[PDB]
């Protein structure tokens, strides 16, 4: 009874992030990347690679 | 090592010193001042000379000087027996439980006897007969009770004697952790029945209740006048809270302990009390203090000022107050007010001895900046004693310095500076073979490097060579083998403390030591011209070190037992694979990676002079790199125009020379990190191929000789062994350094530039992002049609979104995922294609594609754009005014205003987007500062329980006291650092002959049985395939697995059933000079040589394989608790109340998606607050309250919540109005200290008048029966009550009345089906209720994550399966692989008592080792529980062997070496 | 075995250990709706006789109080009706080795 | 080596009868004797020569 969208639907928000890294389990090219900063100001960012079709979690340090 | 020790300590007994400490010390201390004038120590004072030598005076007791006196103990006579503040809680329990008239406890003479008779059984190792003692039962007379006491005690004299006539128990009694549980349950229950009684049972006359304060006083509160009249009815057959003086507690508890001696002989003794002592109550009080020796009470000093010690200021103040109570002891010998200072003295003679032992158990005077620490504060902290100077000592023979790189030393080496090489020494006993070298060391002396600093004579006297000249050293090197005159030291020989040399070894250490590979063992290689420790690049990934100013600790071990373990157990060559998952950690790092993509390229062509120079640049026969003593080369790959060698052909030649000649070449088929399309059309440079040791195809990367699995260095490690794989990293370390010096590698500005064709591409895609912010903002506001940004009906909704944390989360997630698409379109069009320099020449890409340094995300932010600056997962924060910065319009639906950076680091970022990028930069730095403190304590807490846990010799995983944890290590007894190529059957077949003379069977078939386990395996294989369609509960149990019948290291063929299934699946789908029969024989011997070794510390490893990758997942939200706080609930604290408990419900395959979504609404709870639009309460003034409800429309809550209007009638008129009046009455008791509808029918009239009778003040009632839109009633209170906040009452009751709640279940939801698993996720746990829903749910597949609730319903093995699945879900989310063998050992420790025990104090409470508990935390709390127990520490846990100094029993202390003497 | 409907009055619970040879087990029929040993996380439990209990303790050289423990009030120990001192054999499928036989004693 | 032999390795005197480290004492000898090692709380004073 409010007049804005209060919740997300079940399949109405897909991840926009995509970079063409080869998925080492099925051979997919599209891959949702995810960068968060772990260490201090002596080390860069660490990227989380989640594939699109299969969904295998992958991690690259630097 | 020439002073052996004979007698040794093996067990430590805790006890209490009695009153006759006076016998060991006739050196009492009276004068509280420690010195007088002329600086002397006054006699009878705390620095008396009968306590040890002091101030250049001899000891009055030893007669010895300050160097050789041990120091001795004195004692301070307390004039009145104060109580010991450790045991004060454990006498106040016995005080509050004893009857002051009969001097027994307030339990019966038979119920005291029963706990006295069960604890006698439990001090033997027999638990079953204690529960069978309560089986012995049958106007109660005291003759039938004395029969039963002589009947129960008759059974215990037989049950103990029977088990002692067998081998079940010994004369010293059996005691184990499960027996420790059952004893800590009776005594905790025995102190619950004795504590809660009112009257005696051998009489009726009962004692008044007590009271205490902060550990200084005990009061005896006034027995009220009802109960004295209940006393004097029997005794014939004062003021409020009178004080109890300390001596009159002893005169009670002495007489109680004299009477209950039987029960207290077994409360206080957990082993059988062979010495048959008495438990006396003087042990709780303090007759005397004891003064520690003077050496332990020396004065302090700082700068140039000496101060008095801490332990004299607290200890003179006891002795002045002892004097001051003797000053006032004369004031009754000649004889109110003086007893107001006498009783004042007893409180402060208590409060001084209380402040001597503790310091938090006192009161003090003022803020004396955390006043003077007692002897408990010296033990209980991170610092203090038991954790700073027993687990954490400082060491001799150790050096630290900044580290520096070197690719010219080996990988298993360290570069010691010449500063450290002339300081660190090794005691080398001079014998007939090292006399030529130790004479030369003494001649060089302690300045020239191959030298020595001092020698040790045969009587142990040292002779220092520092001040001596070149003649006193030559004339003392000549006397190293001269035998002395003495006959006591005729065995011994001299010891020359030579300097460190190139054959010595060293433990090296990076300082946060999170896993055992951070402390490895190197070989010394002494360098000139340095002051820095100097390391190779293979090691810098193991230590997690980099060359930015990091320091490392160098330890130098001082005997031959430790040199044999820094070479064979902790050396770097055996640390190639980490035990966390079996992945390699040692390899070449940054620029040797980016040189092998040029050397092994297809453009590389070397001539003859160049080819022979890169071979000898890295492979020297003189330094022992070769295997042939003559460097062999290859024919060129081009003959006729000009002879040229290929760069792949150098990698062939270096493997031709460093591998052994008798073994054939390697065979490997692998991949690269570089895709084939970077090299051109139809290239095959992604496929790595080695055939007979020759690189024939493909470049070499991080994925080959980096720290990567199944590369070339990982494969040579498997076929050739760790010594060859450590040479190939050194040979390639020198190969890709001479090639770099001849052919360099740079990175410039032109590497970072897009071409003008491709630079127009990123402009046109970013031109289509100016509309993206509004369209996502028009979507969440549910507008459309491209409403403009200045729409007043749009800006009103954005302000509505802004005030809610929920709605702003939706608008962030929509707009972030919509602009990450434009970020992913710019990158996926530009970065291979729009760049100016293509791949091999563009070194910025070649550092990212090779894995040398960086990622493709770093290249995209440099060349294309930064992207969305996501803050705490959400997006850029916002002010109160709807502004994200002062630069932007309020409620701006620009993508840039929300933090989307359309700029790159090549061209620059604008000032607005430089400010958001500093926001994202800082949340990566404040999260780092809070990262390491979280997972540091999680790892420490695991490594005390899982710390004496080791592989036994019968392959069972046991704890230090012998309690069993697992029966094999992981079910297969395979070491993690061995099972890498164990299931790589294609690799083991291509290298069959080279892998055959490693796992050499010819010299091995006479020490092990062969056919006994192969025969039993085929029975268990044939029988198991006949029963595979059956479920697991209908599995017949004829054939237990072959590992449970045969030892895997004794019998060939005994093999885990999962390895056998993979091996038979390989041989039946692959028909390929090698049979299938002899390939079975190889892979079954390889299983036998990859086993875990006995003595392996699998408890430390399993705890270091969880705490160390948990320093990697501290991050925020990317529904269930994530990461470390989830891991701190399972492992730590054993949370029975998880914050977010769930339940996964597998629906059937014939229940539809509509019938699933209908089933969701029939579970989720519905508050009465969820169907209400408004509540209008009109208060008119007798008083009245017309509460009018407005529900939603009946076609809205019956569709959203499946709630009919017949339910709301029954919910309001049975539940709500009762709860409402229970809040109105509760408030008054704490205070006096549209339309209109009438003309009801008979149904509504009868509904009204009945509910009026059921309630107190409702008097009118109506509900909308036609439409279900309103209820209506009228609370009339009295004509006297004042103003009442009625609407605040009603809102709290509407949100607590439930319409339909299945208990403990808050919400059901139907998520996306993961891999076809149609399931339902339930916010809450109730297994009992979901069994009733069998028409929709596969109830034999329901799955939770509340481990304490799976344990209660399904049992201990189901809970144990949940723990290994829930620790796995934490690590698999962060793409971190840990092996299940670590997780099974953590789970089998937590379920070792049938319960779900934590890693904390409360989980550790049921253990054997007292020193493990004391060293963890609350040291003197566990010490109290151990001294009262009279607990013998067996000294078996490694936390108790480091205290007493005994050899640890894990690894090389898990056996004994015995020498075999030939003569009789 | 006595299967009740709602509850047992605790005055009547005292008659349960009142016979020394014979034991009495109680079950609420709400709990017995699902046989819990058919679940995918509960392995196969087999109680051992004292012949292969005694040969188990000889193989590993154990005291009885050194095996991993299962509580007396465990719903699987109540299912099999384990007395104190009975070693049950658990055949669980490990994630690394396939089938794997473990043991656990009731105290 | 690290937590005993290179940090605080001392060889102490322990009575085998009472089991204590602190209450031992190297005896002040009679002039015609050798200073031996003796424990104090196992020791009884010579005036206690009762028959
Ligand atoms: Zn994939
Ligand atoms: Zn002395
Ligand atoms: Zn009494
Ligand atoms: Zn003694």
From Swiss-Prot, chain A:
Coiled coil: none annotated. This is DNA-directed RNA polymerase I subunit RPA12. Zn(2+) 2 binds at residues 23, 26, 51, 54. A zinc finger (TFIIS-type) spans 19-59. The gene is RPA12. It is found in: Nucleus, Nucleolus. It comes from Saccharomyces cerevisiae (strain ATCC 204508 / S288c). The chain holds residues 64 to 125 of 125 of the full protein. Residues 16-62 are annotated as: Required for RNA cleavage, but not essential for elongation activity. DNA-dependent RNA polymerases catalyze the transcription of DNA into RNA using the four ribonucleoside triphosphates as substrates. Component of RNA polymerase I (Pol I) which synthesizes ribosomal RNA precursors. Besides, RNA polymerase I has intrinsic RNA cleavage activity. Proposed to contribute to the polymerase catalytic activity and form the polymerase active center together with the two largest subunits. Subunit RPA12 contributes a catalytic zinc ribbon that is required for RNA cleavage by Pol I. Involved in transcriptional termination. Present with 8450 molecules/cell in log phase SD medium. Belongs to the archaeal RpoM/eukaryotic RPA12/RPB9/RPC11 RNA polymerase family. It comes from the Eukaryota.
UniProtKB/Swiss-Prot annotation, chain B:
One of its GO terms (molecular function) is DNA binding. Mg(2+) binds at residues 546, 548, 550. The modification Phosphoserine is found at residues 808, 1437. Zn(2+) 1 binds at residues 59, 62, 69, 72. PANTHER family: DNA-DIRECTED RNA POLYMERASE, DNA-DIRECTED RNA POLYMERASE I SUBUNIT RPA1. Present with 2840 molecules/cell in log phase SD medium. This is DNA-directed RNA polymerase I subunit RPA190. The gene is RPA190.
Curated annotation (Swiss-Prot), chain C:
It is found in: Nucleus. It comes from the Eukaryota. Component of the RNA polymerase I (Pol I), RNA polymerase II (Pol II) and RNA polymerase III (Pol III) complexes. Component of the RNA polymerase I (Pol I) complex consisting of 14 subunits: RPA135, RPA190, RPC40, RPA14, RPB5, RPO26, RPA43, RPB8, RPA12, RPB10, RPC19, RPC10, RPA49 and RPA34. The complex is composed of a horseshoe-shaped core containing ten subunits (RPA135, RPA190, RPB5, RPO26, RPB8, RPB10, RPC10, RPA12, RPC19 and RPC40) where RPA135 and RPA190 form the DNA-binding cleft. DNA-dependent RNA polymerases catalyze the transcription of DNA into RNA using the four ribonucleoside triphosphates as substrates. Common component of RNA polymerases I, II and III which synthesize ribosomal RNA precursors, mRNA precursors and many functional non-coding RNAs, and small RNAs, such as 5S rRNA and tRNAs, respectively. Pol II is the central component of the basal RNA polymerase II transcription machinery. RNA polymerase complexes are composed of mobile elements that move relative to each other. Belongs to the archaeal Rpo5/eukaryotic RPB5 RNA polymerase subunit family. This is DNA-directed RNA polymerases I, II, and III subunit RPABC1. The chain holds residues 109 to 215 of 215 of the full protein.
From Swiss-Prot, chain D:
Changing residue 38 to R: Responsible of suppression of RPA190-5 and RPA190-1 mutations. It comes from the Eukaryota. A zinc finger (C4-type) spans 15-42. It is found in: Nucleus, Nucleolus. Component of the RNA polymerase I (Pol I) complex consisting of 14 subunits: RPA135, RPA190, RPC40, RPA14, RPB5, RPO26, RPA43, RPB8, RPA12, RPB10, RPC19, RPC10, RPA49 and RPA34. The complex is composed of a horseshoe-shaped core containing ten subunits (RPA135, RPA190, RPB5, RPO26, RPB8, RPB10, RPC10, RPA12, RPC19 and RPC40) where RPA135 and RPA190 form the DNA-binding cleft. Outside of the core, RPA14 and RPA43 form the stalk that mediates interactions with transcription initiation factors and newly synthesized RNA. DNA-dependent RNA polymerases catalyze the transcription of DNA into RNA using the four ribonucleoside triphosphates as substrates. Component of RNA polymerase I (Pol I) which synthesizes ribosomal RNA precursors. Besides, RNA polymerase I has intrinsic RNA cleavage activity. RPA190 and RPA135 both contribute to the polymerase catalytic activity and together form the Pol I active center. In addition, subunit RPA12 contributes a catalytic zinc ribbon that is required for RNA cleavage by Pol I. Belongs to the RNA polymerase beta chain family. This is DNA-directed RNA polymerase I subunit RPA135. The chain holds residues 1090 to 1140 of 1203 of the full protein.
